[PDB]
Amino acid sequence: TDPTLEWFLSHCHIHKYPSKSTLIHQGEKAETLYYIVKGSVAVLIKDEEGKEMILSYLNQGDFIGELGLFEEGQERSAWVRAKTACEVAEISYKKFRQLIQVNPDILMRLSAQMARRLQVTSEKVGNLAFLDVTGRIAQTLLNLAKQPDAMTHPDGMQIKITRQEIGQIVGCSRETVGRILKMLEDQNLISAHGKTIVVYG
Amino acid sequence: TDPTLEWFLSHCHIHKYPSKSTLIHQGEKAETLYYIVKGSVAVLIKDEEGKEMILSYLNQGDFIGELGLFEEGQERSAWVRAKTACEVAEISYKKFRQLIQVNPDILMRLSAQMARRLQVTSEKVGNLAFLDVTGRIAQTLLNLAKQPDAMTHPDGMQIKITRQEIGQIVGCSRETVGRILKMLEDQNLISAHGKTIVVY
Numbered sequence A: 001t002d003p004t005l006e007w008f009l010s011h012c013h014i015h016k017y018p019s020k021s022t023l024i025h026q027g028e029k030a031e032t033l034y035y036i037v038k039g040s041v042a043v044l045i046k047d048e049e050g051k052e053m054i055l056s057y058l059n060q061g062d063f064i065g066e067l068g069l070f071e072e073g074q075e076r077s078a079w080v081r082a083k084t085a086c087e088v089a090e091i092s093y094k095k096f097r098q099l100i101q102v103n104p105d106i107l108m109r110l111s112a113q114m115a116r117r118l119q120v121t122s123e124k125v126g127n128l129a130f131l132d133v134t135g136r137i138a139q140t141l142l143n144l145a146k147q148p149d150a151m152t153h154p155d156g157m158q159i160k161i162t163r164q165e166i167g168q169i170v171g172c173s174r175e176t177v178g179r180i181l182k183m184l185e186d187q188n189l190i191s192a193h194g195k196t197i198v199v200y201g
Numbered sequence B: 001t002d003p004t005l006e007w008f009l010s011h012c013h014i015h016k017y018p019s020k021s022t023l024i025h026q027g028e029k030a031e032t033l034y035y036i037v038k039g040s041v042a043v044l045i046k047d048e049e050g051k052e053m054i055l056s057y058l059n060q061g062d063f064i065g066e067l068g069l070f071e072e073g074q075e076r077s078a079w080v081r082a083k084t085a086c087e088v089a090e091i092s093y094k095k096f097r098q099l100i101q102v103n104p105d106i107l108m109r110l111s112a113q114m115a116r117r118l119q120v121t122s123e124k125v126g127n128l129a130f131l132d133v134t135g136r137i138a139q140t141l142l143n144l145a146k147q148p149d150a151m152t153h154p155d156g157m158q159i160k161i162t163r164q165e166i167g168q169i170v171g172c173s174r175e176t177v178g179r180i181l182k183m184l185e186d187q188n189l190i191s192a193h194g195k196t197i198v199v200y
């Protein structure tokens, strides 16, 4: 059982958010911490022209908006959009800091999540620096194929994903994803038809 | 410095490291936490080929090797090499977790640094994804103009970085860096005198 989590949750005010709604806006003054009770969200950044890139998918049990907790006057570092319908707990940093005194184990949990996120984001940095847009998309297709939800196909592995989700992962437009996917098909690397993509061998 | 910091340091061993020496090797079993008492280090990762990429620079007052602390059986996520001569304090994770029980404020200081690192690293992800090699270099020069080792100037400030270094942060060749540094000079954005660049 987890008494610490119930204790924490009891000090928050829980709300429901339909999918696609924005929970956090980049630039806002940060004064509250969030905790995903149910559902999943996408943490994303945009460029001066609206092109989006997902930094991470966050799910049940994950804290959100923790980056502004340690210093005053911080701004939210990214937008957070509900991927599915969510049930999110919210609490002011001020109240949260009071809880940390009563039981530091709650901070230990938050920090464990921050360390994992740093490891994963550093990994992305490596890829963005070493691969160009074509390689980024190819490697993404390979990783998707290696995932558990990836189905087995007569000629390799089959994955389901829209050209737009791929664009969000690599940080390019869906039209760009379209051109590269077309090129990859001509090189006999994949087979794209509808929302289904077959990765060969 | 303050009493809490000094309290933490009294439970550590302080070791000296010369320039270019490796403090942490990627893949090692993470069992120790470090604190930079004096000096500077670089955090590096690389691709299947051996090409190095500078993830970050850390300085006096920064903790290092904190990532493997929250879960046992983890490997160091990167290589950490001394940029200058360093004076680094170290303590076992086991002993550190004990200190947390006495005074959690020590964990707060650590977590604050991790939060900052996540912000900076995420920003780096944005730069690499949305900026062309030229855009990256212009930004990097500014990020470097913010370093503690940067010198002032009657026209902006100055850095003593090399073309290999810049290429390692941005993700490009020494040649390309030169090519781009040249352009930025024509456009009156910077001025290079040897290994010294004056960022306006």
Ligand SMILES: Nc1ncnc2c1ncn2[C@@H]1O[C@@H]2COP(=O)(O)O[C@H]2[C@H]1O
Residues within 6 Å of the ligand: A024, A030, A043, A055, A056, A063, A064, A065, A066, A067, A068, A075, A076, A077, A078, A079, A080, A117, A121, B118, B122
């Ligand atoms: N690299 C990342 N990985 C995971 N989550 C992140 C990352 N960058 C930002 N976020 C989350 O997005 C939130 C935006 O608001 P905050 O900056 O307060 O806190 C941020 C973290 O919760």
Ligand SMILES: Nc1ncnc2c1ncn2[C@@H]1O[C@@H]2COP(=O)(O)O[C@H]2[C@H]1O
Residues within 6 Å of the ligand: A118, A122, B024, B030, B043, B055, B056, B063, B064, B065, B066, B067, B068, B069, B075, B076, B077, B078, B079, B080, B117, B121
């Ligand atoms: N993105 C990053 N920014 C700053 N320091 C980092 C980053 N990634 C790794 N490190 C540091 O490099 C260390 C490598 O060993 P650890 O993984 O134990 O701890 C890591 C952190 O101390």
